């Protein structure tokens, strides 16, 4: 490997061999069907709300999130980079697709597949990833840096449906070598959203944009239809000329054929026919190819940028609503703008790289933090783009000031902005994209007094319940299968209108968003204040026995939605205390004296009773009325965790908090698989895992990262990082279970998982407050 010195890959990048087999991979641990796309994954390309494309460590474009809210894992074999090299003096050169695999059928059989093992590495530090190619049959060593412009405090480039592939080529040998790099792409219009005639009318055109000191050559892969539908738009690939490279292209090759129409050209001398051909296809799949060819002398390096864009302006959800995607603000809505997007990227990618470096540098340059922590901190952010992210710029047909936003809990449980989850998972948004965060919270504020008296069957028990109760915060803002933002509470496993955590978490999120954006946004507090008061007042009515605390009802009535709580729980009780303290402080800021007094009075009574009921001398009991009331819960002091972040002080005595956290580390971490797998949710005081429910026997990745943050704030530095380390290890390490770029909600002691591609572990960003 002589190419690594010519590029700049951070030491904290996650690494794997191209073509590496992983032996230890985990699988779902539930009895119902659940997504398992394998460990062949990579960092995604694409902006927020753009639809994303997962290119894996083997080189394939395989995890398709272009249909917003859906996860489709299938390798589109035509989509590749390929290389040709010929040493000056030799009769023939060699050509190789840069993909460690081959197609399942006979399409593209002429291409040279099966990029060999031990011949290159993949690296990722989101939003960047890299591949190096160090192959004994390729005298010139190559590397590519690929990324999308995901940039904190930037809501423009961050939305773009574009990727840059910045290639570096170096000749360490003593002979001249002719080199070509070719990008191939299938015209994917009709890949989704088209019920019949899936390729019909697809056509490819070539754009040559020549001005002084800029030449771009691009293929635009579209359809003859000017219809404005979810399926229609354009893909583009292209390259920018640099000194010493020539560009060649082929507008149309057949993807549903042997591929020799293209490959016979490329494999000969690395130069394509430059054949334009706009003839639309009927049944056959078609694609385009863009190549560069150059000669490298001994010791010479060259850099050349390619790009990919996709202009698919309309997202459709299963309930029938069609919305424009956010990026259409910047490029238009007609779906004929892929070239404009591509050109912006090719002309500005160097600036974007520097903007990315500028945001990563403060963390990367901090030599007190271990590399593994940096690996996790950056790579967990993949989910902000990959989580079915929806970001609208108008309903099709029907303008507003604001752009509604939603991130899925996950794909298996297809619910937008699940509030009990975002309490953990929304830290990157408040810290890095706060205008999105505040918009999402205003979305929740607007739902508080919505009433929907229609009934649904509760999954856990079969009982009928009212969809949405006035004054109760919704579980979620809908499903991609139905009507995001319009029909809330798509979740039906339990009835969220009787949950004891949603209303408190809502208030805590509101105050969090004020505190972590500088305690200056009084208008945000004003917008949400009525809903905050309503939320707390409604939750107070669920206090059955006048101890000042809402009563859990002996069913799962909170985020641990198969784990029953009864009476006063440490979890919901602490959240309630913290929410009351936050509302007191908002009351002070907004000069609402009567609210301050009321919530101060409720807080004092509740605090006193919480302590009496639950403090056992070593930790806080799980609850007051369950069979396993004395279980040690990892998340027992969640309210105090948020209180630390919100600077609300001691809701519980410092001594007791420290004892409880030490107990959790000693038991839930260190007595669970030697502390190498995170914090198990429930442990009995005899040191055996609580078996009352499956969720007690799970480590929740987001709960564990949040607990690490809590320990860190409380000065338990070793415990904090050791606790978080087990989550990193299981996700990323060779000794783990292969969950990179699909971090699950949970795993059991065997390492097998529940709900890959999950929002909650974005809580690792709470470790940076
Ligand atoms: O909907 C999201 C929630 O799902 C919970 O899992 C439940 C599944 O949604 C549900 O389909 C499954 O159904 C069981 C059924 O209860 C049982 O009687 C039958 O024999 O088998 C079905 C599965 O084939 O139940 C599970 C719970 O066990 C998650 O647990 C929850 O966290 C999530 O939010
Ligand atoms: Ca009570």
CSV table of C-alpha atoms in Angstrom, one decimal, residues 296-522:
chain,number,residue,atom,x,y,z
A,296,UNK,CA,1.1,8.2,-15.4
A,297,UNK,CA,4.9,8.4,-15.5
A,298,UNK,CA,7.0,6.8,-12.7
A,299,UNK,CA,6.3,8.7,-9.4
A,300,UNK,CA,3.4,10.8,-10.8
A,301,UNK,CA,0.1,11.4,-9.0
A,302,UNK,CA,-3.2,12.6,-10.5
A,303,UNK,CA,-6.6,13.5,-9.0
A,304,UNK,CA,-9.9,13.4,-10.9
A,305,UNK,CA,-13.4,14.0,-9.6
A,306,UNK,CA,-16.5,12.2,-10.7
A,307,UNK,CA,-20.0,12.8,-9.4
A,308,UNK,CA,-23.5,11.3,-9.3
A,309,UNK,CA,-26.8,13.1,-8.9
A,310,UNK,CA,-30.4,12.1,-8.8
A,311,UNK,CA,-33.3,14.5,-9.4
A,312,UNK,CA,-36.4,12.6,-8.2
A,313,UNK,CA,-38.4,15.6,-7.0
A,314,UNK,CA,-41.5,13.9,-5.7
A,315,UNK,CA,-41.9,11.5,-2.7
A,316,UNK,CA,-45.2,9.6,-2.4
A,317,UNK,CA,-46.4,7.9,0.8
A,318,UNK,CA,-48.8,4.9,0.9
A,319,UNK,CA,-51.7,7.0,2.0
A,320,UNK,CA,-51.5,8.9,-1.4
A,321,UNK,CA,-49.9,12.2,-0.5
A,322,UNK,CA,-47.2,13.5,-2.8
A,323,UNK,CA,-44.6,16.0,-1.6
A,324,UNK,CA,-41.7,17.8,-3.1
A,325,UNK,CA,-38.3,17.0,-1.5
A,326,UNK,CA,-36.3,19.8,0.2
A,327,UNK,CA,-33.6,20.1,-2.4
A,328,UNK,CA,-36.2,21.3,-5.0
A,329,UNK,CA,-36.0,24.6,-3.2
A,330,UNK,CA,-32.5,25.1,-4.7
A,331,UNK,CA,-32.8,23.4,-8.1
A,332,UNK,CA,-36.5,23.4,-9.1
A,333,UNK,CA,-39.4,20.9,-9.0
A,334,UNK,CA,-39.7,19.7,-12.7
A,335,UNK,CA,-37.3,16.7,-12.4
A,336,UNK,CA,-35.1,17.8,-15.2
A,337,UNK,CA,-32.3,19.3,-13.2
A,338,UNK,CA,-29.8,16.4,-12.5
A,339,UNK,CA,-27.1,18.1,-14.6
A,340,UNK,CA,-27.4,21.3,-12.6
A,341,UNK,CA,-26.9,19.4,-9.3
A,342,UNK,CA,-24.0,17.4,-10.7
A,343,UNK,CA,-22.3,20.6,-12.0
A,344,UNK,CA,-22.6,22.3,-8.7
A,345,UNK,CA,-20.9,19.3,-7.1
A,346,UNK,CA,-18.1,19.0,-9.6
A,347,UNK,CA,-17.3,22.8,-9.3
A,348,UNK,CA,-17.5,23.0,-5.5
A,349,UNK,CA,-16.4,19.7,-4.1
A,350,UNK,CA,-13.1,21.0,-2.7
A,351,UNK,CA,-15.0,23.7,-0.7
A,352,UNK,CA,-17.3,21.0,0.6
A,353,UNK,CA,-14.4,18.8,1.7
A,354,UNK,CA,-13.0,21.7,3.7
A,355,UNK,CA,-16.4,22.4,5.3
A,356,UNK,CA,-16.6,18.8,6.4
A,357,UNK,CA,-13.0,18.9,7.7
A,358,UNK,CA,-13.9,22.1,9.6
A,359,UNK,CA,-16.7,20.4,11.5
A,360,UNK,CA,-14.9,17.1,12.2
A,361,UNK,CA,-11.6,18.7,13.2
A,362,UNK,CA,-12.5,19.9,16.8
A,363,UNK,CA,-13.3,16.3,17.7
A,364,UNK,CA,-10.6,14.6,15.6
A,365,UNK,CA,-7.9,16.9,17.0
A,366,UNK,CA,-8.8,16.2,20.6
A,367,UNK,CA,-6.1,13.7,21.6
A,368,UNK,CA,-7.7,13.0,25.0
A,369,UNK,CA,-10.5,11.0,23.2
A,370,UNK,CA,-9.8,7.5,22.0
A,371,UNK,CA,-10.1,6.8,18.2
A,372,UNK,CA,-12.8,4.1,18.7
A,373,UNK,CA,-15.1,6.8,20.3
A,374,UNK,CA,-14.6,9.0,17.2
A,375,UNK,CA,-15.3,6.1,14.9
A,376,UNK,CA,-18.7,5.6,16.6
A,377,UNK,CA,-19.5,9.3,17.1
A,378,UNK,CA,-19.2,10.1,13.4
A,379,UNK,CA,-20.4,6.9,11.9
A,380,UNK,CA,-23.6,6.7,13.9
A,381,UNK,CA,-24.7,9.9,12.1
A,382,UNK,CA,-25.2,7.7,8.9
A,383,UNK,CA,-28.8,7.3,10.3
A,384,UNK,CA,-29.7,11.0,9.9
A,385,UNK,CA,-29.5,10.5,6.1
A,386,UNK,CA,-30.4,6.7,6.0
A,387,UNK,CA,-33.4,6.8,8.3
A,388,UNK,CA,-36.1,7.2,5.7
A,389,UNK,CA,-35.7,10.9,6.1
A,390,UNK,CA,-38.5,13.1,4.8
A,391,UNK,CA,-38.1,16.8,4.4
A,392,UNK,CA,-40.8,18.5,2.4
A,393,UNK,CA,-40.9,21.6,0.1
A,394,UNK,CA,-44.6,21.6,-0.6
A,395,UNK,CA,-47.5,19.2,-1.2
A,396,UNK,CA,-47.9,18.4,-4.9
A,397,UNK,CA,-50.8,20.5,-6.2
A,398,UNK,CA,-51.1,22.9,-3.3
A,399,UNK,CA,-46.6,27.8,-0.1
A,400,UNK,CA,-45.7,27.7,3.6
A,401,UNK,CA,-42.8,29.2,5.5
A,402,UNK,CA,-41.6,26.0,7.1
A,403,UNK,CA,-40.4,22.7,5.7
A,404,UNK,CA,-41.7,19.7,7.7
A,405,UNK,CA,-39.2,17.0,8.6
A,406,UNK,CA,-39.2,13.4,9.8
A,407,UNK,CA,-36.8,10.7,10.7
A,408,UNK,CA,-38.0,7.1,11.1
A,409,UNK,CA,-37.6,5.2,14.4
A,410,UNK,CA,-36.5,2.4,12.0
A,411,UNK,CA,-37.8,0.5,8.9
A,412,UNK,CA,-39.3,-2.5,10.8
A,413,UNK,CA,-41.4,-0.1,12.9
A,414,UNK,CA,-42.1,2.4,10.3
A,415,UNK,CA,-43.1,5.4,12.4
A,416,UNK,CA,-41.8,9.0,11.9
A,417,UNK,CA,-40.3,10.9,14.8
A,418,UNK,CA,-41.3,8.4,17.5
A,419,UNK,CA,-41.1,10.8,20.4
A,420,UNK,CA,-40.2,8.3,23.2
A,421,UNK,CA,-37.2,7.4,20.9
A,422,UNK,CA,-36.2,10.9,19.7
A,423,UNK,CA,-35.8,11.8,23.4
A,424,UNK,CA,-32.6,9.8,22.9
A,425,UNK,CA,-32.0,9.9,19.2
A,426,UNK,CA,-32.4,13.7,18.4
A,427,UNK,CA,-29.2,14.9,20.0
A,428,UNK,CA,-27.4,15.3,16.6
A,429,UNK,CA,-30.3,17.4,15.4
A,430,UNK,CA,-30.3,19.8,18.3
A,431,UNK,CA,-26.5,20.0,18.4
A,432,UNK,CA,-25.8,20.3,14.6
A,433,UNK,CA,-29.0,21.1,12.8
A,434,UNK,CA,-31.1,23.0,15.4
A,435,UNK,CA,-33.5,24.7,12.9
A,436,UNK,CA,-34.7,21.2,11.9
A,437,UNK,CA,-34.9,20.1,15.6
A,438,UNK,CA,-37.1,23.1,16.5
A,439,UNK,CA,-39.3,22.6,13.4
A,440,UNK,CA,-39.9,18.9,14.5
A,441,UNK,CA,-40.8,20.1,18.0
A,442,UNK,CA,-43.2,22.7,16.7
A,443,UNK,CA,-44.8,19.8,14.7
A,444,UNK,CA,-45.4,18.0,18.0
A,445,UNK,CA,-46.7,21.2,19.7
A,446,UNK,CA,-49.3,21.6,16.9
A,447,UNK,CA,-50.7,18.0,17.6
A,448,UNK,CA,-51.3,18.5,21.4
A,449,UNK,CA,-55.0,19.3,21.2
A,450,UNK,CA,-55.8,17.2,18.1
A,451,UNK,CA,-58.6,14.8,18.8
A,452,UNK,CA,-59.3,11.7,16.6
A,453,UNK,CA,-62.2,9.8,18.1
A,454,UNK,CA,-62.0,6.9,15.6
A,455,UNK,CA,-60.9,3.6,17.1
A,456,UNK,CA,-58.0,1.2,16.4
A,457,UNK,CA,-57.3,-2.3,17.7
A,458,UNK,CA,-54.4,-2.3,20.2
A,459,UNK,CA,-52.0,-5.0,19.1
A,460,UNK,CA,-50.8,-6.2,22.6
A,461,UNK,CA,-54.3,-7.1,23.9
A,462,UNK,CA,-56.9,-6.8,21.1
A,463,UNK,CA,-58.8,-4.0,22.8
A,464,UNK,CA,-60.3,-1.0,20.9
A,465,UNK,CA,-58.9,2.5,21.7
A,466,UNK,CA,-59.3,6.1,20.6
A,467,UNK,CA,-56.7,7.1,18.0
A,468,UNK,CA,-55.7,10.5,19.5
A,469,UNK,CA,-56.8,12.1,22.8
A,470,UNK,CA,-56.8,15.8,23.3
A,471,UNK,CA,-53.9,16.9,25.5
A,472,UNK,CA,-51.8,13.8,25.0
A,473,UNK,CA,-48.7,14.0,22.9
A,474,UNK,CA,-48.6,11.5,20.0
A,475,UNK,CA,-46.3,8.5,19.8
A,476,UNK,CA,-45.3,9.4,16.2
A,477,UNK,CA,-46.2,11.6,13.3
A,478,UNK,CA,-47.3,8.8,11.0
A,479,UNK,CA,-45.9,6.1,8.8
A,480,UNK,CA,-44.4,6.2,5.2
A,481,UNK,CA,-47.1,3.5,4.4
A,482,UNK,CA,-49.8,6.0,5.3
A,483,UNK,CA,-49.7,9.8,5.7
A,484,UNK,CA,-46.6,11.3,7.4
A,485,UNK,CA,-47.4,14.6,9.2
A,486,UNK,CA,-51.1,14.3,8.5
A,487,UNK,CA,-52.2,11.1,10.2
A,488,UNK,CA,-50.4,10.8,13.5
A,489,UNK,CA,-50.1,7.8,15.9
A,490,UNK,CA,-49.6,5.1,13.2
A,491,UNK,CA,-48.1,3.0,16.0
A,492,UNK,CA,-50.7,0.5,17.5
A,493,UNK,CA,-48.9,-2.1,19.5
A,494,UNK,CA,-49.9,-0.2,22.6
A,495,UNK,CA,-52.2,2.8,23.2
A,496,UNK,CA,-49.9,5.8,23.4
A,497,UNK,CA,-52.7,8.1,24.7
A,498,UNK,CA,-52.2,6.4,28.1
A,499,UNK,CA,-48.4,6.5,28.1
A,500,UNK,CA,-46.7,8.0,31.1
A,501,UNK,CA,-43.4,9.1,29.4
A,502,UNK,CA,-44.5,10.9,26.2
A,503,UNK,CA,-45.9,14.1,27.8
A,504,UNK,CA,-42.9,14.5,30.1
A,505,UNK,CA,-40.3,13.7,27.4
A,506,UNK,CA,-42.0,16.3,25.2
A,507,UNK,CA,-41.6,19.0,27.8
A,508,UNK,CA,-38.0,18.0,28.4
A,509,UNK,CA,-37.2,18.1,24.6
A,510,UNK,CA,-38.7,21.6,24.4
A,511,UNK,CA,-36.5,22.8,27.3
A,512,UNK,CA,-33.5,21.0,26.0
A,513,UNK,CA,-33.8,22.7,22.6
A,514,UNK,CA,-33.9,26.1,24.3
A,515,UNK,CA,-30.9,25.4,26.5
A,516,UNK,CA,-28.6,23.7,23.9
A,517,UNK,CA,-29.2,26.6,21.4
A,518,UNK,CA,-28.0,29.2,23.9
A,519,UNK,CA,-31.0,30.0,26.0
A,520,UNK,CA,-32.0,32.8,23.6
A,521,UNK,CA,-35.0,31.5,21.7
A,522,UNK,CA,-37.8,32.9,23.7
